[PDB]
Amino acid sequence: KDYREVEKLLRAVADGDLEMVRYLLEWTSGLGVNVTSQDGSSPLHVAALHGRADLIPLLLKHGANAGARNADQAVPLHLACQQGHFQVVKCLLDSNAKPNKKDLSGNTPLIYACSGGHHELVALLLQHGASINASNNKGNTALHEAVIEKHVFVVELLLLHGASVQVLNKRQRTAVDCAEQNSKIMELLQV
Protein backbone atom coordinates (compact mmCIF):
# COMPACT_ATOMS: atom_id res chain seq x y z
CA LYS A 1 0.00 0.00 0.00
CA ASP A 2 2.97 2.40 0.19
CA TYR A 3 3.65 3.26 -3.44
CA ARG A 4 5.08 6.65 -2.53
CA GLU A 5 8.66 5.53 -3.23
CA VAL A 6 7.71 3.80 -6.48
CA GLU A 7 5.99 7.02 -7.53
CA LYS A 8 9.14 8.97 -6.80
CA LEU A 9 11.02 6.76 -9.15
CA LEU A 10 8.48 6.75 -11.94
CA ARG A 11 8.22 10.55 -11.78
CA ALA A 12 11.96 10.66 -12.27
CA VAL A 13 11.82 8.10 -15.21
CA ALA A 14 8.94 10.10 -16.73
CA ASP A 15 10.92 13.37 -16.53
CA GLY A 16 13.86 11.66 -18.24
CA ASP A 17 16.00 12.15 -15.17
CA LEU A 18 18.88 9.74 -15.35
CA GLU A 19 20.85 10.97 -12.30
CA MET A 20 17.71 10.88 -10.17
CA VAL A 21 16.92 7.34 -11.34
CA ARG A 22 20.49 6.42 -10.53
CA TYR A 23 20.28 7.86 -6.99
CA LEU A 24 16.96 6.31 -6.25
CA LEU A 25 18.11 2.85 -7.49
CA GLU A 26 21.71 3.21 -6.26
CA TRP A 27 23.66 2.34 -9.39
CA THR A 28 27.55 2.37 -9.73
CA SER A 29 14.00 1.18 0.50
CA GLY A 30 13.04 -1.85 -1.66
CA LEU A 31 13.04 -0.07 -5.04
CA GLY A 32 14.25 -1.97 -8.06
CA VAL A 33 14.42 -1.66 -11.83
CA ASN A 34 11.25 -3.80 -12.16
CA VAL A 35 8.96 -2.55 -9.40
CA THR A 36 5.39 -1.56 -10.23
CA SER A 37 3.12 1.28 -9.47
CA GLN A 38 -0.36 0.15 -8.57
CA ASP A 39 -1.23 0.00 -12.34
CA GLY A 40 1.54 -2.34 -13.19
CA SER A 41 3.62 0.52 -14.60
CA SER A 42 7.28 -0.45 -14.37
CA PRO A 43 10.00 2.10 -15.08
CA LEU A 44 10.47 0.61 -18.56
CA HIS A 45 6.77 1.29 -19.32
CA VAL A 46 7.03 4.78 -18.07
CA ALA A 47 10.18 5.46 -19.99
CA ALA A 48 8.57 4.15 -23.18
CA LEU A 49 5.40 6.03 -22.63
CA HIS A 50 7.26 9.32 -22.23
CA GLY A 51 9.74 8.58 -24.87
CA ARG A 52 12.82 8.53 -22.77
CA ALA A 53 15.10 6.81 -25.17
CA ASP A 54 18.27 7.73 -23.25
CA LEU A 55 17.02 5.84 -20.18
CA ILE A 56 16.17 2.61 -21.92
CA PRO A 57 19.61 1.08 -22.51
CA LEU A 58 20.41 1.73 -18.87
CA LEU A 59 17.23 0.25 -17.49
CA LEU A 60 17.75 -2.77 -19.72
CA LYS A 61 21.44 -2.91 -18.68
CA HIS A 62 20.26 -3.24 -15.04
CA GLY A 63 17.64 -5.87 -15.82
CA ALA A 64 14.43 -4.12 -16.73
CA ASN A 65 12.00 -6.60 -18.19
CA ALA A 66 10.74 -5.61 -21.69
CA GLY A 67 7.85 -8.10 -21.52
CA ALA A 68 6.51 -6.82 -18.23
CA ARG A 69 2.72 -6.49 -18.44
CA ASN A 70 0.87 -3.68 -16.86
CA ALA A 71 -2.80 -3.86 -15.89
CA ASP A 72 -3.89 -3.68 -19.53
CA GLN A 73 -1.44 -6.47 -20.27
CA ALA A 74 0.33 -3.82 -22.27
CA VAL A 75 4.10 -4.16 -22.58
CA PRO A 76 6.30 -1.14 -22.94
CA LEU A 77 6.42 -1.51 -26.71
CA HIS A 78 2.71 -0.83 -26.83
CA LEU A 79 3.09 2.55 -25.22
CA ALA A 80 6.05 3.69 -27.19
CA CYS A 81 4.03 2.67 -30.28
CA GLN A 82 0.89 4.48 -29.03
CA GLN A 83 2.97 7.65 -28.72
CA GLY A 84 5.08 7.28 -31.79
CA HIS A 85 8.51 7.20 -30.10
CA PHE A 86 10.88 6.00 -32.78
CA GLN A 87 14.13 5.70 -30.82
CA VAL A 88 12.43 3.99 -27.94
CA VAL A 89 10.82 1.45 -30.24
CA LYS A 90 14.10 0.96 -32.01
CA CYS A 91 15.99 0.57 -28.83
CA LEU A 92 13.57 -1.95 -27.46
CA LEU A 93 13.32 -3.94 -30.74
CA ASP A 94 17.10 -4.03 -30.81
CA SER A 95 17.11 -5.39 -27.28
CA ASN A 96 14.88 -8.13 -28.45
CA ALA A 97 11.56 -6.89 -27.23
CA LYS A 98 8.88 -9.08 -28.92
CA PRO A 99 6.69 -7.20 -31.41
CA ASN A 100 3.72 -9.55 -31.43
CA LYS A 101 2.15 -9.18 -28.00
CA LYS A 102 -1.46 -8.34 -27.51
CA ASP A 103 -2.99 -6.37 -24.66
CA LEU A 104 -6.48 -6.86 -23.34
CA SER A 105 -8.12 -4.95 -26.19
CA GLY A 106 -6.25 -7.45 -28.41
CA ASN A 107 -4.13 -4.64 -29.86
CA THR A 108 -0.48 -4.94 -31.00
CA PRO A 109 2.29 -2.51 -31.22
CA LEU A 110 1.85 -2.28 -34.97
CA ILE A 111 -1.81 -1.69 -34.66
CA TYR A 112 -1.26 1.12 -32.10
CA ALA A 113 1.38 2.77 -34.27
CA CYS A 114 -0.87 2.57 -37.31
CA SER A 115 -3.95 3.56 -35.40
CA GLY A 116 -2.07 6.56 -34.14
CA GLY A 117 -0.68 7.47 -37.53
CA HIS A 118 2.96 6.96 -36.67
CA HIS A 119 4.24 5.98 -40.08
CA GLU A 120 7.87 6.28 -39.05
CA LEU A 121 7.35 3.12 -36.97
CA VAL A 122 5.70 0.81 -39.50
CA ALA A 123 8.71 -0.37 -41.51
CA LEU A 124 10.79 -0.66 -38.40
CA LEU A 125 8.31 -2.93 -36.74
CA LEU A 126 7.79 -5.05 -39.89
CA GLN A 127 11.47 -5.52 -40.01
CA HIS A 128 11.60 -6.87 -36.57
CA GLY A 129 8.80 -9.26 -37.40
CA ALA A 130 5.50 -7.68 -36.59
CA SER A 131 2.65 -9.65 -38.11
CA ILE A 132 1.19 -7.24 -40.61
CA ASN A 133 -2.16 -8.98 -40.56
CA ALA A 134 -2.75 -9.58 -36.88
CA SER A 135 -6.09 -8.26 -35.64
CA ASN A 136 -7.47 -6.84 -32.37
CA ASN A 137 -10.65 -7.80 -30.51
CA LYS A 138 -12.82 -5.86 -32.91
CA GLY A 139 -11.20 -7.97 -35.66
CA ASN A 140 -9.40 -4.88 -36.97
CA THR A 141 -5.95 -5.03 -38.49
CA ALA A 142 -3.34 -2.41 -38.53
CA LEU A 143 -4.68 -1.57 -41.93
CA HIS A 144 -8.34 -1.35 -40.83
CA GLU A 145 -7.35 1.10 -38.08
CA ALA A 146 -5.14 3.24 -40.36
CA VAL A 147 -8.07 3.56 -42.71
CA ILE A 148 -10.67 4.32 -40.12
CA GLU A 149 -8.38 7.04 -38.66
CA LYS A 150 -7.44 8.17 -42.18
CA HIS A 151 -3.65 8.00 -41.90
CA VAL A 152 -2.80 7.98 -45.57
CA PHE A 153 0.99 7.51 -45.27
CA VAL A 154 0.44 4.56 -42.94
CA VAL A 155 -2.01 3.02 -45.45
CA GLU A 156 0.55 3.48 -48.22
CA LEU A 157 3.24 1.77 -46.19
CA LEU A 158 1.10 -1.15 -45.16
CA LEU A 159 -0.04 -1.80 -48.71
CA LEU A 160 3.52 -1.51 -49.94
CA HIS A 161 4.52 -4.18 -47.41
CA GLY A 162 1.71 -6.35 -48.59
CA ALA A 163 -0.92 -6.06 -45.97
CA SER A 164 -4.02 -8.09 -46.75
CA VAL A 165 -7.14 -6.21 -47.87
CA GLN A 166 -9.49 -9.12 -47.44
CA VAL A 167 -9.56 -9.42 -43.69
CA LEU A 168 -13.05 -9.01 -42.38
CA ASN A 169 -13.40 -7.29 -39.03
CA LYS A 170 -16.21 -8.38 -36.69
CA ARG A 171 -18.74 -6.19 -38.44
CA GLN A 172 -17.87 -7.87 -41.81
CA ARG A 173 -15.93 -4.92 -43.15
CA THR A 174 -12.56 -4.85 -44.81
CA ALA A 175 -10.08 -2.06 -45.05
CA VAL A 176 -11.81 -1.06 -48.30
CA ASP A 177 -15.39 -0.81 -47.12
CA CYS A 178 -14.05 1.43 -44.26
CA ALA A 179 -12.67 4.15 -46.52
CA GLU A 180 -14.42 7.23 -47.78
CA GLN A 181 -16.21 6.96 -51.03
CA ASN A 182 -13.70 8.74 -53.34
CA SER A 183 -10.93 9.05 -50.72
CA LYS A 184 -7.35 9.16 -51.86
CA ILE A 185 -7.20 6.27 -49.44
CA MET A 186 -9.88 4.47 -51.51
CA GLU A 187 -7.83 4.88 -54.67
CA LEU A 188 -4.87 3.28 -52.87
CA LEU A 189 -6.93 0.31 -51.74
CA GLN A 190 -7.70 -0.55 -55.46
CA VAL A 191 -4.15 -0.83 -56.83
Binding site: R11, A12, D15, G16, D17, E19, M20, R22, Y23
Partner: protein, 157 residues
Protein backbone atom coordinates in the same frame (compact mmCIF):
# COMPACT_ATOMS: atom_id res chain seq x y z
CA UNK B 1 0.45 24.33 -1.99
CA UNK B 2 3.17 25.67 -4.29
CA UNK B 3 5.88 22.97 -4.50
CA UNK B 4 8.70 25.43 -4.70
CA UNK B 5 9.15 26.47 -1.00
CA UNK B 6 12.06 28.88 -1.05
CA UNK B 7 14.53 30.50 -3.29
CA UNK B 8 17.70 32.57 -2.98
CA UNK B 9 20.40 34.23 -4.84
CA UNK B 10 23.86 34.19 -3.20
CA UNK B 11 27.51 34.80 -3.71
CA UNK B 12 29.65 32.57 -1.57
CA UNK B 13 27.92 32.48 1.84
CA UNK B 14 26.55 35.96 1.30
CA UNK B 15 22.79 35.90 0.36
CA UNK B 16 21.81 38.82 -2.01
CA UNK B 17 18.08 38.15 -2.21
CA UNK B 18 15.63 35.49 -0.92
CA UNK B 19 11.98 34.75 -0.75
CA UNK B 20 9.91 32.12 1.08
CA UNK B 21 6.13 31.88 0.97
CA UNK B 22 5.70 30.03 4.24
CA UNK B 23 7.46 29.57 7.58
CA UNK B 24 10.48 27.39 8.12
CA UNK B 25 14.11 27.07 8.94
CA UNK B 26 15.11 27.92 5.34
CA UNK B 27 17.98 30.23 6.21
CA UNK B 28 19.43 27.79 8.72
CA UNK B 29 19.47 25.04 6.02
CA UNK B 30 20.39 27.40 3.25
CA UNK B 31 23.46 28.73 5.08
CA UNK B 32 24.78 25.30 5.67
CA UNK B 33 24.16 24.49 1.92
CA UNK B 34 26.02 27.61 0.76
CA UNK B 35 29.11 26.75 2.76
CA UNK B 36 29.48 23.50 0.92
CA UNK B 37 29.29 24.96 -2.59
CA UNK B 38 32.49 25.20 -4.58
CA UNK B 39 32.81 28.63 -6.10
CA UNK B 40 33.69 27.16 -9.57
CA UNK B 41 30.64 26.77 -11.93
CA UNK B 42 28.61 23.68 -10.98
CA UNK B 43 25.07 22.31 -10.56
CA UNK B 44 23.73 19.87 -8.02
CA UNK B 45 20.73 18.57 -6.28
CA UNK B 46 20.64 17.38 -2.69
CA UNK B 47 17.95 15.04 -1.53
CA UNK B 48 16.97 15.57 2.13
CA UNK B 49 13.97 14.05 3.84
CA UNK B 50 10.99 14.77 1.64
CA UNK B 51 12.54 17.76 0.01
CA UNK B 52 15.06 18.52 -2.58
CA UNK B 53 17.58 21.33 -2.72
CA UNK B 54 18.88 22.51 -6.10
CA UNK B 55 21.26 25.10 -7.32
CA UNK B 56 23.27 26.40 -10.07
CA UNK B 57 26.53 28.20 -9.46
CA UNK B 58 27.68 30.30 -12.34
CA UNK B 59 30.17 33.25 -12.54
CA UNK B 60 30.24 32.76 -8.70
CA UNK B 61 26.61 33.46 -8.19
CA UNK B 62 24.48 30.68 -6.64
CA UNK B 63 20.83 30.43 -7.67
CA UNK B 64 19.18 28.03 -5.19
CA UNK B 65 15.78 26.71 -4.40
CA UNK B 66 14.11 24.17 -2.10
CA UNK B 67 11.11 22.21 -3.08
CA UNK B 68 8.99 19.21 -2.25
CA UNK B 69 10.41 15.95 -3.40
CA UNK B 70 7.62 15.48 -5.98
CA UNK B 71 8.37 18.54 -8.15
CA UNK B 72 10.36 17.40 -11.22
CA UNK B 73 13.97 18.45 -11.48
CA UNK B 74 13.32 19.79 -14.96
CA UNK B 75 10.76 22.22 -13.67
CA UNK B 76 13.19 23.25 -10.88
CA UNK B 77 16.13 23.86 -13.09
CA UNK B 78 14.05 25.85 -15.46
CA UNK B 79 12.90 28.05 -12.54
CA UNK B 80 16.53 28.61 -11.68
CA UNK B 81 17.65 29.36 -15.18
CA UNK B 82 14.90 31.82 -15.49
CA UNK B 83 15.73 33.57 -12.11
CA UNK B 84 19.35 33.62 -13.19
CA UNK B 85 18.69 35.12 -16.54
CA UNK B 86 16.77 37.94 -14.85
CA UNK B 87 19.39 38.38 -12.11
CA UNK B 88 22.23 38.55 -14.59
CA UNK B 89 20.46 40.97 -16.89
CA UNK B 90 19.34 43.28 -14.14
CA UNK B 91 22.50 43.39 -11.99
CA UNK B 92 25.40 42.33 -14.13
CA UNK B 93 28.77 42.49 -12.41
CA UNK B 94 27.36 44.33 -9.31
CA UNK B 95 26.75 40.93 -7.80
CA UNK B 96 30.41 40.21 -7.65
CA UNK B 97 30.98 42.71 -4.79
CA UNK B 98 27.44 43.26 -3.40
CA UNK B 99 26.93 43.28 0.38
CA UNK B 100 24.40 41.10 2.16
CA UNK B 101 20.78 41.40 0.94
CA UNK B 102 21.78 44.27 -1.39
CA UNK B 103 19.38 42.97 -4.05
CA UNK B 104 16.68 41.84 -1.77
CA UNK B 105 14.34 44.82 -1.77
CA UNK B 106 14.25 44.75 -5.63
CA UNK B 107 14.55 41.04 -6.46
CA UNK B 108 12.71 39.08 -3.81
CA UNK B 109 9.48 40.08 -5.56
CA UNK B 110 10.88 38.87 -8.87
CA UNK B 111 11.73 35.61 -6.99
CA UNK B 112 8.20 35.50 -5.68
CA UNK B 113 6.57 36.03 -9.07
CA UNK B 114 8.69 33.33 -10.70
CA UNK B 115 8.26 30.87 -7.86
CA UNK B 116 4.53 31.22 -8.19
CA UNK B 117 4.60 31.01 -11.95
CA UNK B 118 6.84 27.96 -12.09
CA UNK B 119 4.95 26.23 -9.29
CA UNK B 120 1.70 26.46 -11.30
CA UNK B 121 1.98 23.66 -13.99
CA UNK B 122 7.53 20.11 -21.46
CA UNK B 123 10.36 21.14 -23.86
CA UNK B 124 13.46 18.93 -24.42
CA UNK B 125 15.98 21.74 -23.64
CA UNK B 126 14.54 21.52 -20.06
CA UNK B 127 14.97 17.73 -19.64
CA UNK B 128 18.50 17.71 -21.25
CA UNK B 129 19.51 20.38 -18.75
CA UNK B 130 19.55 17.55 -16.26
CA UNK B 131 22.33 15.68 -17.84
CA UNK B 132 25.11 15.17 -15.36
CA UNK B 133 23.41 17.09 -12.47
CA UNK B 134 24.09 14.59 -9.75
CA UNK B 135 21.77 13.94 -6.82
CA UNK B 136 23.42 13.72 -3.45
CA UNK B 137 22.81 13.47 0.20
CA UNK B 138 23.80 16.22 2.53
CA UNK B 139 25.05 16.34 6.12
CA UNK B 140 23.17 19.15 7.94
CA UNK B 141 23.63 19.90 11.71
CA UNK B 142 20.99 21.01 14.18
CA UNK B 143 21.53 23.34 17.21
CA UNK B 144 22.11 20.48 19.63
CA UNK B 145 24.34 18.50 17.22
CA UNK B 146 21.81 16.02 15.83
CA UNK B 147 20.74 15.74 12.22
CA UNK B 148 19.02 18.92 11.12
CA UNK B 149 15.70 18.51 9.27
CA UNK B 150 13.96 21.14 7.20
CA UNK B 151 10.81 21.91 9.16
CA UNK B 152 8.23 24.15 7.60
CA UNK B 153 4.69 25.25 8.26
CA UNK B 154 2.44 25.51 5.19
CA UNK B 155 -0.24 27.31 7.34
CA UNK B 156 1.94 30.49 7.22
CA UNK B 157 2.03 33.86 5.29
Amino acid sequence: SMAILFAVVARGTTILAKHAWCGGNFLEVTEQILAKIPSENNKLTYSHGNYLFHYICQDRIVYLCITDDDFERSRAFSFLNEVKKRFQTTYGSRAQTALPYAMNSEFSSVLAAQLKHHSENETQAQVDELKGIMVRNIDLVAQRGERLELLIDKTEN
